[PDB]
């Protein structure tokens, strides 16, 4: 029957269909495989930018963008970023990248996030005959710097001793609020087809028989503010981390309806198909920025 027909929300709600628009893990994105000199590797592949995502290394929230340990350094002295090269490839400012690609009309005018992704996808290992492997990156809005990540791993907690493998986990945090985690597949029109802003005075719902109905079942987590609700949705979202096949393809608890008055983060794993206008609510996603709101309804 036609219970889902005549939905005026279809185009507007397309960006909230995370399996379709992102198509990979969020918390941990390892949605693709790449063969390099006989060995199979895992790599981030989500089509959307992940706003406010960083990696916490053994309590330290200020280390993951530091270059990876080289030469005589012990492994725990470094972070996850590409080490210095001659000439320098990473980090590079937005202006530095626009200047670097000035003769390339297909690259030079890309938005900052897509440009960072394409710059990180540029240098290919000489061992990689088929150019399969493309590094992920972090864009820092505070100083407009693109950081190529040499380490594509996002979680490890097999971990411990300065030379032993460090323990690490992904998270939204005040210290990561200006970061953007970018896979090699970030789409050039993410602004149009991916989430970013939290929706003020709105709650996600499901369109049924010409009306926007409430999500029938939600998982209630208490949250002091929108930021804490966004952190909880991220912690529960699509994950490609090995549980022991290890690909979520974007499936997970990716959405939350934040009631600012009851201070409840109403978390769910089914895609929303409409919005309800309710002044008590803010609609968030695991991909969304933990602070920014869009005051206007829709």
């Amino acid at each position: 029957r036609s219970n889902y027909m005549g939905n005026p929300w279809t185009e507007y709600m397309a960006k909230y269909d995370i399996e379709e628009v992102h198509g990979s893990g969020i918390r941990v994105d390892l949605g693709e495989d790449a063969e390099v000199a006989g060995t199979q590797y895992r790599l981030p592949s989500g089509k959307c930018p992940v706003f406010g995502k960083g990696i916490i290394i053994e309590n330290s929230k200020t280390t993951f963008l530091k270059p990876v340990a080289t030469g005589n350094q012990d492994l725990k002295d470094g972070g996850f970023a590409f080490p210095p090269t001659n000439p320098l490839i990473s980090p590079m400012t937005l202006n530095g990248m626009r200047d670097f690609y000035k003769n390339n009309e297909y690259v030079k005018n890309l938005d900052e996030l897509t440009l960072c992704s394409r710059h990180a996808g540029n240098m290919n290992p000489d061992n990689d005959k088929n150019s399969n492997y493309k590094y992920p990156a972090v864009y820092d809005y505070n100083d407009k710097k693109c950081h190529i990540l040499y380490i594509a791993a996002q979680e490890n907690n097999y971990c411990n001793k300065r030379n032993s493998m460090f323990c690490f986990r992904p998270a939204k945090d005040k210290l990561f609020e200006n970061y953007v985690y970018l896979s090699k597949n970030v789409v050039d029109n993410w602004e149009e087809v991916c989430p970013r802003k939290n929706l003020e005075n709105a709650k996600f719902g499901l369109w049924v028989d010409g009306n926007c109905e409430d999500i029938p079942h939600v998982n209630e987590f208490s949250a002091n503010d929108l930021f804490e609700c966004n952190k909880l949705v991220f912690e529960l979202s699509a994950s490609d981390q090995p549980k022991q096949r290890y690909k979520s393809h974007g499936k997970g608890y990716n959405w939350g309806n934040y009631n600012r008055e009851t201070q409840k983060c109403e978390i769910f794993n089914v895609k929303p198909t409409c919005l309800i206008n309710d002044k008590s609510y803010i609609a968030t996603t695991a991909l969304s920025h933990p602070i920014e709101v869009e005051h206007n309804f829709p």
């Binding site: 590797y41 340990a69 240098m123 290992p125 000489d126």
Partner: protein, 35 residues
């Protein structure tokens, strides 16, 4: 453990790189990455 490093996303031990965006340019890590 070797399999675990691959399953969590650890990438290839790589020293030299070549651009996929023109012009072709070689870039090498002067000192080896701590493994």
């Amino acid at each position: 453990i070797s399999q675990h490093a691959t399953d969590i996303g650890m990438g290839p031990a790589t020293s030299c790189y070549t651009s996929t965006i023109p012009p072709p340019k070689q870039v090498c890590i002067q000192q080896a990455v701590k493994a």
